[PDB]
């Protein structure tokens, strides 16, 4: 996307979102990142929406195919599951590569740094969902390390109701429950996150209250399913 203006790539990413063309949206946002400038808050959201939709479709397909393959336990189901898996891994590697070259290293404010480290944890988590054996172990530790650095910054630098802090805690709790075989850690984190946010709601405007309570409900939903 090297010949397109940065501002045009951003404009086209917004149009692609409206048209539900998420692969296009991700390509436009990759082009925008590769211009080398830092991303604004809105632009970071566009990058995340684009890739979350792309990898979300891949994960759903991988789960369908993995379930068929397990039931069957010709080569076609395994071969096709492997194809989808390789494509998913390629998208995760692309996102991780954008974060490593050079979004994280240039991110000095807490909001941007926490956002990118949460993304790094998420994309290693998606790699971990399809990994097997020893490579699973190092992938899992990479996810954990990214989430932990993000958590450490968020606790020092953001209020407990900040939506990025809340979403980070939500996703790290999912990591603990689904990836790390640590359901007690997942439950503890979701409970403490919810309780500390509830005690800070009194400080918020009506609009911020809505933003924070929406994510708090997701924490509550998980706690209900896990307990």
């Amino acid at each position: 996307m090297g010949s397109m203006e940065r501002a045009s790539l951003i404009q086209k990413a917004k149009l692609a979102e409206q048209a539900e063309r998420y692969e296009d949206m991700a390509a436009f946002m990759k082009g925008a990142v590769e211009k080398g400038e830092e991303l604004s808050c809105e632009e970071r959201n566009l990058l995340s929406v684009a890739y979350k939709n792309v990898v979300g479709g891949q994960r759903a397909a991988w789960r369908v195919l993995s379930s068929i393959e397990q039931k069957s336990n010709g080569p076609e189901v395994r071969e096709y599951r492997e194809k989808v898996e390789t494509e998913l891994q390629g998208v995760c590697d692309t996102v991780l590569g954008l974060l490593d070259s050079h979004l994280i290293k240039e991110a000095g404010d807490a909001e941007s740094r926490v956002f990118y480290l949460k993304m790094k944890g998420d994309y290693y988590r998606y790699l971990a969902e399809v990994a097997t054996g020893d490579d699973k172990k190092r992938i899992i530790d990479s996810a954990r390390s990214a989430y932990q650095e993000a958590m450490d910054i968020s606790k020092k630098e953001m209020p407990p109701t900040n939506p990025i802090r809340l979403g980070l805690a939500l996703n790290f709790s999912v990591f603990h429950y689904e990836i790390a075989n640590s359901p007690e850690e997942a439950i503890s984190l979701a409970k403490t996150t919810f309780d500390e946010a509830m005690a800070d709601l009194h400080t918020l405007s009506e609009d911020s209250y809505k933003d924070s309570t929406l994510i708090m409900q997701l924490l509550r939903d998980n706690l209900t399913l896990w307990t």
Binding site: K14, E17, N45, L46, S48, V49, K52, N53, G56, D122, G167, L170, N171, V174, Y177, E178, I215, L218, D221, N222, L225, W226
Partner: peptide, 9 residues
């Protein structure tokens, strides 16, 4: 269970 949906800007 459920992570941040994050599908809509």
């Amino acid at each position: 269970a459920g992570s941040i949906p994050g599908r809509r800007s």
